[PDB]
Amino acid sequence: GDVTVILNNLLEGYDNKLRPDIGVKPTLIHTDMYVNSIGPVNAINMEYTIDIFFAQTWYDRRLKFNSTIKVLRLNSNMVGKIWIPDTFFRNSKKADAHWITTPNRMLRIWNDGRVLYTLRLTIDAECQLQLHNFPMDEHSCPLEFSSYGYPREEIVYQWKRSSVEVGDTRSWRLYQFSFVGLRNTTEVVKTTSGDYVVMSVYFDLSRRMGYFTIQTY
Amino acid sequence: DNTTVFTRILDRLLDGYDNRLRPGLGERVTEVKTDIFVTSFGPVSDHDMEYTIDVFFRQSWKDERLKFKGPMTVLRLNNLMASKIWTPDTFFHNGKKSVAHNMTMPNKLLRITEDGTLLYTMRLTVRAECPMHLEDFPMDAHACPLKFGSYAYTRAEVVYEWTREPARSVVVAEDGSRLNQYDLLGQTVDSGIVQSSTGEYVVMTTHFHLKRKIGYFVIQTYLPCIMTVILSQVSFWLNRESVPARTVFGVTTVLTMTTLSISARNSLPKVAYATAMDWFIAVCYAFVFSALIEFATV
Amino acid sequence: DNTTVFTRILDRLLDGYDNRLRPGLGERVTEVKTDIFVTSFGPVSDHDMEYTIDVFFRQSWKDERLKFKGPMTVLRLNNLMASKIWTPDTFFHNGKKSVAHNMTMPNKLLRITEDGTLLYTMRLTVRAECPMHLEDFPMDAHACPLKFGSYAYTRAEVVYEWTREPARSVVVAEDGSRLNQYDLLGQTVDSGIVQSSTGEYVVMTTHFHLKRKIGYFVIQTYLPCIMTVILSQVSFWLNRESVPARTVFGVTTVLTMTTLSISARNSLPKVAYATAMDWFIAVCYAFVFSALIEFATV
Amino acid sequence: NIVMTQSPKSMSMSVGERVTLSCKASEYVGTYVSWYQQKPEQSPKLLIYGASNRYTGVPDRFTGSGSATDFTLTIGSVQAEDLADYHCGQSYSYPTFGAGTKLEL
Amino acid sequence: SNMSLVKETVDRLLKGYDIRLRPDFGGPPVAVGMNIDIASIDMVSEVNMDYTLTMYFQQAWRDKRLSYNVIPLNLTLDNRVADQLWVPDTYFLNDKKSFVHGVTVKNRMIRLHPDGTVLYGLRITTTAACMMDLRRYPLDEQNCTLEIESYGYTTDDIEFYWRGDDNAVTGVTKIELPQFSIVDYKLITKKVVFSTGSYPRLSLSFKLKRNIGYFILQTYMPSILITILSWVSFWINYDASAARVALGITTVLT
Amino acid sequence: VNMDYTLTMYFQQAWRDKRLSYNVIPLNLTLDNRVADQLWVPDTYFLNDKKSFVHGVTVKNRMIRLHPDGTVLYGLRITTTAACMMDLRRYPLDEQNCTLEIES
Amino acid sequence: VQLQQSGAELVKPGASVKLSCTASGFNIKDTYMYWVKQRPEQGLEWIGRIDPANGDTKYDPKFQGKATITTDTFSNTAYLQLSSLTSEDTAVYYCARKGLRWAMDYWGQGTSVTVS
Ligand SMILES: *[C@@H]1O[C@H](CO)[C@@H](O[C@@H]2O[C@H](CO)[C@@H](O[C@@H]3O[C@H](CO[C@H]4O[C@H](CO[C@H]5O[C@H](CO)[C@@H](O)[C@H](O)[C@@H]5O[C@H]5O[C@H](CO)[C@@H](O)[C@H](O)[C@@H]5O)[C@@H](O)[C@H](O[C@H]5O[C@H](CO)[C@@H](O)[C@H](O)[C@@H]5O)[C@@H]4O)[C@@H](O)[C@H](O[C@H]4O[C@H](CO)[C@@H](O)[C@H](O)[C@@H]4O[C@H]4O[C@H](CO)[C@@H](O)[C@H](O)[C@@H]4O[C@H]4O[C@H](CO)[C@@H](O)[C@H](O)[C@@H]4O)[C@@H]3O)[C@H](O)[C@H]2NC(C)=O)[C@H](O)[C@H]1NC(C)=O
Ligand SMILES: *[C@@H]1O[C@H](CO)[C@@H](O[C@@H]2O[C@H](CO)[C@@H](O[C@@H]3O[C@H](CO)[C@@H](O)[C@H](O)[C@@H]3O)[C@H](O)[C@H]2NC(C)=O)[C@H](O)[C@H]1NC(C)=O
Ligand SMILES: *[C@@H]1O[C@H](CO)[C@@H](O[C@@H]2O[C@H](CO)[C@@H](O[C@@H]3O[C@H](CO)[C@@H](O)[C@H](O)[C@@H]3O)[C@H](O)[C@H]2NC(C)=O)[C@H](O)[C@H]1NC(C)=O
Ligand SMILES: *[C@@H]1O[C@H](CO)[C@@H](O[C@@H]2O[C@H](CO)[C@@H](O)[C@H](O)[C@H]2NC(C)=O)[C@H](O)[C@H]1NC(C)=O
Ligand SMILES: CCc1c(C(=O)OC)ncc2[nH]c3cc(OC)c(OC)cc3c12
Ligand SMILES: CCc1c(C(=O)OC)ncc2[nH]c3cc(OC)c(OC)cc3c12
Ligand SMILES: CCc1c(C(=O)OC)ncc2[nH]c3cc(OC)c(OC)cc3c12
Ligand SMILES: *[C@@H]1O[C@H](CO)[C@@H](O)[C@H](O)[C@H]1NC(C)=O
Ligand SMILES: *[C@@H]1O[C@H](CO)[C@@H](O)[C@H](O)[C@H]1NC(C)=O
Hints:
Chain E: Histamine binds at residues 91, 150-151, 196. Chain E: This is Gamma-aminobutyric acid receptor subunit beta-2. Chain E: 4-aminobutanoate binds at residues 151, 196. The structure is cut from a larger assembly and holds 1 copy of chain A, 2 copies of chain B, 1 copy of chain D, 2 copies of chain E and 1 copy of chain G. Chain B folds into 2 domains: 2-213, Acetylcholine Binding Protein, Chain: A; 214-298, Methane Monooxygenase Hydroxylase, Chain G, domain 1 (Up-down Bundle), CATH 1.20.58.390. Helix content of chain B is 26%, strand content 34%. Chain B has helices at 4-14, 215-234, 243-265, 276-297, and strands at residues 30-40, 44-45, 50-62, 74-77, 90-92, 99-100, 108-113, 117-129, 141-150, 158-162, 170-172, 182-196, 199-212. In chain B, strands 1, 2, 3, 4, 6, 7, 8, 10 and 11 form a 9-stranded mixed β-sheet that branches. Chain B has a 4-stranded antiparallel β-sheet with strand order 5-9-13-12, with no helix packed on it. The radius of gyration of chain B is 30 Å and the shape is elongated. By secondary structure, chain G is mainly beta. Chain G has a single domain, classed as Immunoglobulins (Immunoglobulin-like), CATH 2.60.40. Chain G has strands at residues 2-5, 9-11, 17-24, 33-38, 45-51, 56-59, 67-72, 77-82, 91-96, 111-115. In chain G, 31% of the residues are buried. Chains in contact: A-B, A-F, B-E, C-D, C-E, C-F, C-G, D-G. A molecule of 3 linked components (NAG-NAG-BMA) binds next to strand 8, strand 11 and strand 12 of chain E.
């Protein structure tokens, strides 16, 4: 009864077409990521697969509820009511969310208006490979994302300190390669519509020549 | 008229019902009882390190808000009623691409008991990743897992338990088995808790134990290797004078062994380390080569 | 303001309109006038026995419930108006899988005349099954049909007809022909009636006449077979002493002939009967065998 | 463009005998043939539309047989009031008509 | 006048209609009769161990809520009305993937009758799993089936049956496969018990005999021809070692 | 073999709509992409595309941006498999010419 | 349901004339109007047709240019106009409807044209 009243009050007179602080200042989003597994790195198409939990955090003044509850832990039902950033991956050939048994989405609204929204993703990203001096070659395939319709004056992304977290790496489907490490980056890219803040993550992979060795050499 | 009583009951259940809030959101932890009936254990694709499986996924919990009194103790309802009430949001950690079947209507059922207990079953196909260690290929066995748990609810809100004795909770149909070159020895289940940056979650695990069948690899790979080696030693019995005959024996045998190596290596996925079959092919290749060198020395 | 009169007209049209009832549901027959413009005749897959085709499927009928008077005589509305009114449920009897193109918006146009006439066009790709008899392969011609009618509306309720003269109602674009190894000679339309359990329906039929091109096969198989036969003949002129050379002729001719015989069969689907190509290959193989027999005799 | 040839140009018999008329199309017309009868000092009347369908208000005596190019009209048990011309026409393309058949006695 | 009367009757029927409750919700089981018109069978593959078949799937039950007695003619409705009526939740146990054809509209049919009977048609393509025994391949007979069952309704709620027992399924004889022959087919009715209850089931099964001509021309004949070369090797003289050895090796390679 | 090519692009369209003009706000406000379902947008289509989709992660890759004078921008990230019938007579010394017809 | 054709007429050679075919019981906009000429003791000859909804007309090659066909959609009639009339044009002209598989279901009473 209490939580129902809180959720009803939050959504009365709420416009999800308008970003928080629309006419005031840019919305700052603290993106975070957990890397479940990096799939095969093929070469016939110069791409690789990755499976991640993507988390985004921002502040929404319109969702400040005053009560004894510290946090509202909600499922995917409420995702479609509040404003959500339109983040897409710039260098992804194809991506998809998961919908079994129900949409793999989460939403947690804190007392001070903070919102945390996470979802499970499977991305096929294109990383051009320097096909000279292979299989002796070593690369670093990137993963880039940014807002689609909001330029730098509206949405700003920012990595946390411990954003990217990787799993065991023993069960990963990297046969030819191995996971050396990763980096991260942020820049500004000028497009026809405007200037966008582009975030990047680099996965450094070292190659293993065993398979081609045995097969051909 | 006759059914208006049931319509009134169903309208009473839903009015003033919030499906954004889990049962007992104030004073307890929602316990969800899981149960899997495997109608068919689909094929295993070692190239992708994944397997397919069709299941009836059954879940049961208690909702105080759905109590009622009527001529029937259990309401065997349509599956579109399930979108109005709270249902657990389970997901498969290692799942890759699952599908919830929708022919000719959604393959779901919902049943409400007068005391408020719900049974929610659904039919779905899961493509799950099964890591494989092919050191003993083709004499190898595997334990393909299937993990699931709650997205968005930590251990303090939703917990998972097996409906029956954990040994009898996952059941495989006797008729249904679509394995071509594997054998399902058995299954074992386990439960645990996983720490995460977003909280602690309850993870339910199942292992399907597989053993490979060797006959195909025998006939396709080993028998030709044995025959070619036998031919290589047959080469010795010819007269030394007939040099061309021995030369062609040697060349053709070496070539057959090379082509069989490149052919046998393509079956299994590309992997850095070497398999047992690879050692067998290598040793047979060594024998053929030594035989040819012996002829050259003679 | 200038847009408000048209909004009033559109609101007047829809109010008190039941799109579940076909026009003239009580007394007369809804007579739908059809038409096709083929933007491209896609590839023909003999292995699956099917062909692809892209069309602008046009349908027109009369609905007295949609008469209006206003500043303009014809209304050119979006493709979301067609979901509010009743439209015929046409389908392709021999289709395998079709797509109604949806990029960037649904490819549909609806136009309403002041007398109630409707023009309803839509762009879609059809994969239709085309039975083929391959006895004369590759010197064969086919008529691949495209039959469409109504689902659930028998002849007593909905009847189809060609918009223009039947000979000019299926138009093929001059620049649209994606056929690689075929030629489209022409098409013919017929209109008939089909009996089924649910009732008696009207079927519009169209045949596209195709003739296969033999250029590829001549270079691929026929010339190689002739050259193998000639090489096999060459053995006669060799000196009797050089037995190994003639043995090599025989073995290589037979091996390449077997490879060619295997190659030829994969060009077409598994069929019990024997194609003309198979007869030619068999006769050439018989000629090689006869050359060897003559060798043995001499 | 498409020529329709009607045979016989004329033929007759007594009342009640089966009578058959034959019309053949030079090219392909897929059941879009029609049969009309023109009484003296009158306009044509449609008898058979499509290859075989019988027009409303026509006795069951008349029947039409169809094909791609060879069509026939049979009058089972001809009565004594069927003494008019008979025209076959095709509508697969721009309409054309046959020379007509005269029926007497 | 009929248009207005039909509209009034249709609005009257759907008014206050509870789609969540099956016909005779508290009463005895509702009976559903099924026809099938097989339209084609395709892609009977051993690699995937399945086959594809298109069909017109029809069901027929009686819903007393939909009975009308003022419009003396059975009326067909736009297929979209099927989203406002109760229809059984039939499913195919052994299918892999299937769809209802959706061009130019969803190939679905609703046909009411004055007494209350509902006729519900669908054009469905489904890839069904057929586990094949290849011990006698390519001289083997296969037995592929379709497993129709109710999901959420037990035998206390719904009962299935073939409508027109022998004539329930039509169009099988007209089917033509490239390398197969439909020896015969059978219609089976039974009940299956799960942990949740017993459910009505119908099975449609086909017996397929594989044609051997293709294989005779493809595989069996070349091998018999190759053995001829080995005998030819026997004919050649003993002196020509190189020729005879080349003959043997070429035979093995082919 | 398929006589087609694939390409991803950022497809953008601009048109002026009197009904969407405002004068009390001096900025070119950008709306959530779900508002595109409540406005009028042209029914552009590609005549020679075999299959195409609009990328949908994390949300439909779609843009709307009004302007005070009424101008509307409408962006989409599309992947389309257009058809391109090739002449292979000079293969592999051939030059191809692949198009993309955009029509209303 | 009925086509009320013009009355009989007499025209001197080398002149031009026009004929009317009034239609009742239906709207000509929904069908194609046909014009057929029958010289005495010869088979029917197709002159041309008009699609009243947009005025599209197609003519037999023989009569191309000779005849012009138009429709008065408001008054619901079709018109045939013959020009440069000769002594071989004397015949009976018919006005015909279209429906049910392009069959010319309805015909007019026929109009007589006589050239001296
Ligand atoms: C050209 O035509 C194309 C064909 O039509 C067209 O593609 C179609 O586009 C539409 C719209 O973009 C798609 O519809 C959306 O689908 C989203 C999910 O998409 C994935 O899943 C579908 C199948 O969806 C089923 O499963 C999900 C999850 O399980 C359910 O949520 C669905 O309702 C649906 O459920 C049924 O079906 C199951 C069987 O499958 C049954 O078991 C089950 O019981 C149900 O019967 C797939 O088909 C998709 O695949 C396609 O798309 C991907 C995209 O990448 C492609 O790659 C792929 O190749 C395919 O093409 C995909 O995998 C839905 O989430 C979405 O619905 C939400 O949003 C809309 C819009 O606001 C709402 O109206 C709607 O109500 C939903 O919002 C509610 O739910 C979300 C949770 O998801 C909440 O967060 C939200 O707050 C809201 O909750 C509120 O409402 C609830 C009521 O639903 C209520 O319960 C809550 O309590 C709360 O009040 C939308 O339906 C459609 O799938 C596409 N189909 C295909 C074949 O592509 C294409 O766009 C056209 N092109 C152009 C240019 O126009
Ligand atoms: C799986 O199957 C079920 C039932 O066959 C599908 O449910 C149906 O979904 C359609 C489209 O989402 C629903 O139509 C909608 O109706 C609302 C009004 O209620 C309207 O606003 C929409 O525009 C649309 O027409 C339909 O009512 C619904 N039927 C039932 C019984 O639930 C489901 O969509 C299927 N899932 C997939 C992925 O195909
Ligand atoms: C293809 O395989 C199916 C599956 O085995 C065969 O169906 C089987 O058919 C037999 C005889 O028709 C059934 O046995 C009968 O059972 C009834 C039960 O009441 C009993 O009264 C009879 O005396 C008889 O024993 C059997 O149940 C049925 N299998 C299943 C699983 O239901 C089918 O015959 C095979 N061949 C063809 C051409 O379909
Ligand atoms: C991910 O990005 C963050 C922010 O850009 C990086 O955080 C910096 O970490 C270094 C430690 O090596 C600190 O000295 C800096 O002060 C941090 N910057 C900020 C703004 O906090 C982080 O190093 C990146 N992780 C990588 C590249 O692996
Ligand atoms: C830690 C990743 C994660 C995230 C995320 O994005 O963190 C960056 N969000 C929501 C999540 N729900 C989970 C449920 C789980 O088990 C049932 C689970 O298992 C390890 C992980 C998550 C999870
Ligand atoms: C003659 C042995 C051989 C050779 C060769 O050259 O050895 C001299 N090459 C390739 C081969 N593939 C085989 C497949 C078989 O089973 C179906 C088989 O069965 C006995 C033998 C072979 C075989
Ligand atoms: C006769 C040689 C040959 C052989 C063989 O070894 O038979 C003895 N096998 C495959 C072949 N494909 C060819 C294609 C050609 O061009 C169209 C061609 O030139 C006319 C010759 C061959 C050919
Ligand atoms: C409706 O259909 C049934 C069965 O097809 C038939 O018996 C009945 O006569 C039909 N009703 C009418 C009014 O034609
Ligand atoms: C709004 O968009 C236009 C687009 O050309 C741009 O010129 C203008 O600077 C923008 N206004 C603001 C305040 O960013």
